[PDB]
Amino acid sequence: QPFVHSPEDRYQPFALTDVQQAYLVGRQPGFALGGVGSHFFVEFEIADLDLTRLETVWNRLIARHDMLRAIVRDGQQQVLEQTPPWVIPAHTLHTPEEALRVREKLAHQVLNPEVWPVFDLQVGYVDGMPARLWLCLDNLLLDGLSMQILLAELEHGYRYPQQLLPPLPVTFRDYLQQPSLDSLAWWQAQLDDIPPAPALPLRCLPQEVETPRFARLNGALDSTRWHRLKKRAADAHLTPSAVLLSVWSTVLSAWSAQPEFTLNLTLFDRRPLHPQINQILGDFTSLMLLSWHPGESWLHSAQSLQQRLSQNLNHRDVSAIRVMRQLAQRQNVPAVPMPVVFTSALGFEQDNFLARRNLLKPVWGISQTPQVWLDHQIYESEGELRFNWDFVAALFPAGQVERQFEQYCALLNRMAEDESGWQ
Ligand code: NA
């Protein structure tokens, strides 16, 4: 079907996605966590920052991407035609300690989605040190792939400020309006075979965390080992995502009260309704449950997970949001939460995202998701697999997440080197 553009309605309100609605209500106390926002925060270091150049690039991106000018208003989303140019606030800091105090303030700020802008961008000059760029974007409006697109454009524009990009020919607003946007029956069919989320040890009731604060652990698998592990995956009839999911679930099983459990998978692939759809910013998130049922050998367990994954992917028009409701109705409980999440940006041609030699050098970051305890996020860059776990640190016993991360990194590396554990 041909894409239907409605430029005369470009600035009219439009409906929020299911994911966006969940984020907004996740600002309030819920079944699995206190209220929290949904933003993504990164600190970059820039040698010899040219503020005027950065401001030009950023304002071009605001003009280029409708969803940077979006707000939530009267229960819907809306793109603002004209917004005041962003004049970047700059702080003068005399020590790295002073800059850390600013980072801490900005990384945990609350973006009000009702008042433009639903982002923040400030800089900090530190005497005799690289300047800092503190960037805050909201997953309420820009999904993970959108944030990779936008950050790559920000790097590219700052490096090559003379290049002008032609306007985008398709909008997120119009995408959501397309017609294309028994799967429900297929999901209802196996409500009895979806086990609860991982029953991980907690140091308190998660509902009793009034102001959840996220922390991050990050790692990488070097490009030689990641190539080798992808090859071994192929030889064992597993996608790379299935291998990573199975390695992670092995660690989670070892800590959980029950060895079988369900994860919520966050995916970003877009329906191919316009040839340039992968170039725009918006919320294209899909959520999909996937259960881990360990068997005799890791390999058998991974192969069962891959088969389940392949089938489930065929039914993502029914969201995990809906399935969790069906699960709670079937089980006669108020809610069935899925607070342990796996988020994959593999496969989206964002090669060399955050490439080592980037002028905007990422040095620190954190992300929040309401009603989530632990989010394992992955992406590929410069041939390496890069990953981070974002988690509510206060929920878990001291040292627990750090130890699980240590075990996960060790197992990942060993399985990339050592053929033994592939049965
Ligand atoms: Na977020």
Numbering used by the authors: 1483 to 1663, 1669 to 1910
Publication excerpt:
Cy domains catalyze consecutive condensation and cyclodehydration reactions, although the mechanism is unknown. To better understand Cy domain catalysis, here we report the crystal structure of the second Cy domain (Cy2) of yersiniabactin synthetase from the causative agent of the plague, Yersinia pestis. The second dataset was solved to 2.35 Å resolution using the 1.94 Å resolution HMWP2-Cy2 model. These structures demonstrate the pseudodimeric fold characteristic of the condensation domain superfamily, which is a two-lobed arrangement of two chloramphenicol acetyltransferase–like folds.
Here, we report the 1.94 Å resolution crystal structure of the Cy2 domain of Ybt synthetase (HMWP2-Cy2), which with its acceptor PCP (HMWP2–PCP2) forms the NRPS half of the NRPS–PKS interface. Two X-ray datasets were obtained for two crystals of HMWP2-Cy2. The first dataset was solved to 1.94 Å resolution by molecular replacement using the structure of the Cy domain from epothilone biosynthesis (EpoB-Cy; 35% sequence identity) as a search model. HMWP2-Cy2 crystallizes in the space group P41212 with one molecule in the asymmetric unit. Electron density maps obtained using the 1.94 Å resolution data permitted building residues Q1483–L1663 of the N-terminal subdomain and N1669–Q1910 of the C-terminal subdomain (HMWP2 numbering) but did not support building the hinge linker between the N- and C-terminal subdomains. The conformation of HMWP2-Cy2 defines an open and continuous tunnel, with a solvent-accessible surface volume of ∼543 Å3. The putative catalytic dyad residues (D1862 and T1830) and helper residue (Q1864) are found in conformations resembling EpoB-Cy and BmdB-Cy2 (45). Intriguingly, the HMWP2-Cy2 active site contains an unexpected metal-binding site against β1 and the latch strand. This metal site involves three backbone carbonyl groups (S1520, H1521, and Q1855), a carboxamide (N1621 following the first aspartate of the DXXXXD motif), and two crystallographic waters, giving rise to a distorted octahedral coordination geometry.
